[PDB]
Design a protein around this ligand. Structure first.
Ligand SMILES: *Cc1c(COP(=O)(O)O)cnc(C)c1O
Ligand SMILES: *Cc1c(COP(=O)(O)O)cnc(C)c1O
Ligand SMILES: O=C[C@H](O)COP(=O)(O)O
Ligand SMILES: O=C[C@H](O)COP(=O)(O)O
Ligand code: NA
Ligand code: NA
Lengths: 267, 390, 390, 267
């Protein structure tokens, strides 16, 4: 399949950037997480970035640490996540679905088997957060054998050799980090990313989605203006979950309002 | 690209987010440079000798072995400043931090010994130290926490996950992911992403080098085996390293068997866990069937690292080293025996190593064998634990 | 009649009941013989080196002295096996006991460090050890009491009198008065009846001998002064002995000033008590106007001996050594300062010595002076005390 | 004065041994201790041995440790002891009164001054328990300048040089120890003391009083038969005090019964 390529073509025809929310699958329970995801899509998400609960999420700040804790309190397992993913794909045939995973969950039962399972349920891409390019060979090879785009992070401290590698190896989109650190809506990246963005385009990298710290409409429009293809927002979304745990209905209303606003900013 | 191989066979690697790779490459290059630098080597040796108290004694234990053909020596890391072998490598890592121009230290700790060690080195060498510690561990190690603060380090409780060592390991890496330009991460064992397994072995290898010279002086030959406990693998690789090419010398590492391997309440991932990828490396891990990382259990708080150094997994795979386990009750028995027969109180960690030596002796008392146990630390910290059990 | 002079000027002597005089004469003769015996000297040296961890380091403290013209070294008895200098002389006394054919050891202890020391030496050397300890001290030193028992010694609480160190001293002598044929009394300081002041100095004098060689190596000259705390006088006479004939080297001993000399709640009998006769000797004592013996008060439990070794009273009288005092708050300040600036936790006893060095530096920061402080022990035992005060 | 010499002459004329009780002055209070002492004399004591409460009585077993504790609870001081002694002498002109002291109380305010005070109140002898012959010079000299007999202990482990010294230096009586150890009625000496006794007489020592562990009549008669001039009993007496603290009247009756019995055994 070529869902990212079809999306970015469509968006380019409308001179629009992508708005891509992140949530942790199963936070705060399977049924509510499925409803959350449908709301994100109905309110204008162009693609999804989705996490699988893990015991030791070392690239995540407290907001996402807490989403994982909530999912674990609900008993959420990787196998349950895969069933959710199949169900999400059965409802929504074209939206790109990307996973953001920790290495041990990919390697656990065999790297090839993980990518095969992603292809069976309809996932389009996988970013493994704790696998740098230097260790990526078996992951990217397995991804490509199963028609899954392997995603790499382009960090702010990237040198030219890394840009070339990222551009060569990645598919679907390039994850352009806003800043150093871990995920979190509190901490906004402010570094100029124009140069990295141009260098990636020069090297024919997959289109760039800016992520980490994106929590407001003006940051979506800023990312698109700098030349990125879009932006990812996770902690900001997850905080709406955390603040509304006691009112599931109000939780969906606020998610709708926020995603609608963030998506409007990409146009 | 790296200067040194990041793998020991299939184990090891550099499984960190991309943003931390420059910090690892910088550290590897600083280390390679320091190892060829006579001034760095002289400075490290001076602190080891005149601050930490090296060389440490090699003590023969004739009361323990009476009536048998075992001769047993203990390498006395319990006499090093701080009471455990950890002091050797924190001094070298502190010096590497200064060589790179860093002024701040981040460290994790479980039982607290690594945090005390990191705080003392940082106090001596003028570094600002912050320590991450699982909140459950903070609650049960109030003495160590107070020592860290007396030494001027900031101790930050970690409440995420299981609130123990692995979660402090995560938090340390989250911090470094944002502060690597000014801070060095002073990792506490011979594990984690390259180059840490290699740097920690080389900054502990004086344990085995001294042992070799000491045993040759006293017995005129190498040991039949050297025996060391394995929490994360630092004291054991420091004892083993200099003997790896001495093919006649056995290398036995002892993981904690807890309540018994069959109970599942143990800390023996090398022989009874499953390979995974966590904490920057591919190595045997305590983990569930679905891949979630779990804790190690031992009566000894310091054998709590839920994985093991990749060099040990490699030495095991090729059969150069053998790994076994010792239960809580076996360790307690060895602790009591050393106190009563030699007047030395061993750390409950080290007691695992001594317990396996005692089994080698007792099971075949007429076998002639020259054994060295690495006595990795002193056990004054363990007397309440032992008192309460008893 | 004795082989050696039992007096240091007017101080010292053998004030025991007549029934104990043969035991003292026997011990003096065994000691004189041992001191000329190359095999005894080799055996003692071997235990000191390979069991206890001698020689101990001499550590320079540049962070403490920055900005001043003081250079300060610490002699690291905190790194000796057991954590304090007491281990040196219990090993020699254990060997004297065996030389005389005795199989049992009696010892007294206040804070417990002497009891742990006696128990460890007796465990190593196959002696049956019984320890007397004031019941008030038993209650407040549960850790030490448990260490003694883990090492196989019998600990007997003493409820008579004030139920503290002096009453344990009495009870030890009452026992020996009836068991001297089989038991050696392993006295804990350089005090009591001759020949104890002399034997304990000679079995501690390697402290000063090593210091001299170490300072000559590192600085090419002798210290301007060597500074040591004075509870009963053992660590201080062990540091001073080798320098007594070096007239340019100051000898400063530091008694505990407690809450302040003017409050009367102190432990400074050498400079602020009155000569009396007790515990087998004529020496300065804490005592009432009518002659009843009283306790010494200090924040540090181990500076509790209510008198002082007769050699110190003699060195003071002729002006070869100078004695001063340091209060509880001064000792606490020195304890905090060493932890934070050098990463070493000093015993609160030793902290008195370090506090006086810090005053010598701070009061005249432009005076050029090379000082050695005897760091008699480690302070891990004192962290609760210090935590509670703070 | 020559009270011991007059006593031993009188007793020799009646072929009798001396019976000499010990008590701690002021146990269990000044007034009761004075009454105790008068009872001991009325019931047949030939001489007294008296202790002054001290903080650290290192030659004493528990019975006498406790007498000292009781005297201290009553606030008994050395100066109060000296007043008692003067009063005892004023009531009883001929009975020998010997002190058993610890060194620090003698040396405290000056050795000479201590012996002068003893002469002023009428004391006949002083044994300093923690001063061996080798340290006795200033004590014996001060005693003799003030007409006080200096007493020495002849221990069971005595060699010939010690016997000669004891015989030369001592006056009044020689304290013949029954055994090693410390005071206490529980522990009875059983060593044959005949040889020491003969050697002392050969060297013209002061007459021997056997002490430590003497708690029964048969031990008094045994001491006299072996050649001693008498016997001292302290813990046995003190135990009668300790067991009768609640009934001062019964305490005196039992002391009377016991001393009468012990004195009868010396005849
Ligand atoms: C920390 C510690 C250990 C365990 O760590 P390793 O890295 O396996 O050596 C063992 N012994 C002592 C005394 C320790 O403090
Ligand atoms: C016992 C002790 C002292 C006091 O005793 P001294 O005989 O005066 O040396 C001093 N420092 C330490 C650490 C001790 O344990
Ligand atoms: O891609 C997922 C991350 O959660 C995005 O970063 P964030 O949480 O800082 O928005
Ligand atoms: O002379 C006084 C002693 O108290 C006598 O010994 P004792 O107490 O064993 O009878
Ligand atoms: Na482990
Ligand atoms: Na003192």
């Amino acid at each position: 399949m070529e869902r990212y390529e079809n999306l970015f073509a469509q968006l380019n025809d409308r001179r629009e950037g992508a708005f891509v929310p992140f949530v942790t699958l199963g936070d705060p329970g399977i049924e509510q997480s499925l409803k959350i995801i449908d709301t994100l899509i109905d309110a204008g998400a162009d693609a999804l970035e989705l996490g699988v609960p893990f015991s030791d999420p070392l690239a995540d700040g407290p907001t996402i640490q807490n989403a994982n804790l909530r999912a674990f309190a609900a008993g959420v397992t990787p196998a349950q996540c895969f069933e959710m993913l199949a169900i999400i794909r059965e409802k929504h045939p074209t939206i790109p679905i990307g996973l953001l995973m920790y290495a041990n969950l990919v390697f656990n039962n065999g790297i090839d088997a993980f990518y095969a399972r992603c292809e069976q349920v309809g996932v389009d891409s996988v970013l493994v957060a704790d696998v740098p390019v230097e260790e990526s060979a078996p992951f990217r090879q397995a991804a490509l054998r199963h028609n899954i785009a392997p995603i790499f992070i382009c960090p702010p401290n990237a040198d030219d050799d890394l840009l070339r590698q990222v551009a060569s190896y990645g598919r679907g989109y390039t994850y352009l980090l806003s800043r150093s650190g871990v995920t979190g809506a509190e901490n906004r990246g402010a570094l100029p990313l124009h140069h990295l963005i141009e260098k990636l385009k020069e090297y024919h990298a997959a289109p760039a989605l800016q992520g980490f710290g994106i929590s407001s409409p003006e940051q979506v429009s800023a990312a698109v203006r700098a030349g990125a293809a879009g932006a990812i927002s996770g902690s900001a979304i997850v905080k709406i979950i955390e603040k509304n745990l006691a009112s599931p209905k109000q939780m969906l209303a606020e998610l709708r309002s926020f995603v609608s606003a963030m998506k409007a900013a990409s146009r | 690209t790296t200067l040194l191989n990041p793998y020991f066979g299939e184990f090891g690697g550099m499984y960190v987010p991309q943003i931390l790779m420059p910090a690892l490459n910088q550290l590897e290059e600083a280390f390679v440079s320091a190892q060829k630098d006579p001034e760095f080597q002289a400075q490290f040796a001076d602190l080891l000798k005149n601050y930490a108290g090296r060389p440490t004694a090699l003590t023969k234990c004739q009361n323990i072995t009476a009536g048998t053909r075992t001769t047993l020596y203990l390498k006395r890391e319990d006499l090093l400043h701080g009471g455990a072998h950890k002091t050797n490598q924190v001094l070298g890592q502190a010096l590497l931090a200064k060589r790179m121009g860093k002024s701040e230290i981040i460290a994790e700790t479980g039982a607290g010994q690594h945090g005390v060690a990191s705080a003392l080195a940082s106090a001596l060498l003028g570094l600002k130290c912050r320590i991450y510690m699982g909140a459950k561990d903070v609650e049960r190690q109030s003495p160590n926490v107070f020592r860290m603060r007396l030494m001027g380090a900031e101790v930050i409780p970690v409440h995420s996950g299981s609130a123990t060592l692995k979660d402090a390991c995560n938090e340390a890496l989250r911090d470094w992911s944002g502060s690597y330009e000014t801070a060095h991460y002073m990792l506490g064992t011979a594990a984690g992403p390259h180059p840490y397994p290699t740097i920690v072995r080389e900054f502990q290898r004086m344990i085995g080098e001294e042992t070799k010279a000491q045993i040759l002086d006293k017995e005129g030959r190498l040991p039949d085996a050297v025996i060391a406990c394995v929490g994360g693998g630092s004291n054991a690789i420091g004892m083993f390293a200099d003997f790896i090419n001495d093919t006649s010398v056995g290398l036995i590492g002892v993981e904690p068997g807890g309540h018994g391997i069959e109970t599942g309440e143990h800390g023996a991932p090398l022989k009874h866990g499953r390979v995974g990828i966590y904490f920057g490396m591919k190595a045997p891990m305590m983990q569930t069937a679905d891949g979630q990382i779990e804790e190690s259990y031992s009566i000894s708080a310091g054998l709590d690292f839920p994985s093991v150094g990749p060099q040990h997994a490699y030495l095991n795979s090729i059969g150069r080293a053998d790994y076994v386990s010792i239960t809580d009750d076996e360790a307690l028995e060895a602790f009591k025996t050393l106190c009563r027969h030699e007047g030395i109180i061993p750390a409950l960690e080290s007691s695992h190593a001594l317990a396996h030596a005692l089994k080698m002796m007792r099971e075949q008392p007429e076998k002639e064998q020259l054994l060295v146990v690495n006595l990795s630390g002193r056990g004054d910290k363990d007397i309440f634990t032992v008192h309460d059990i008893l």
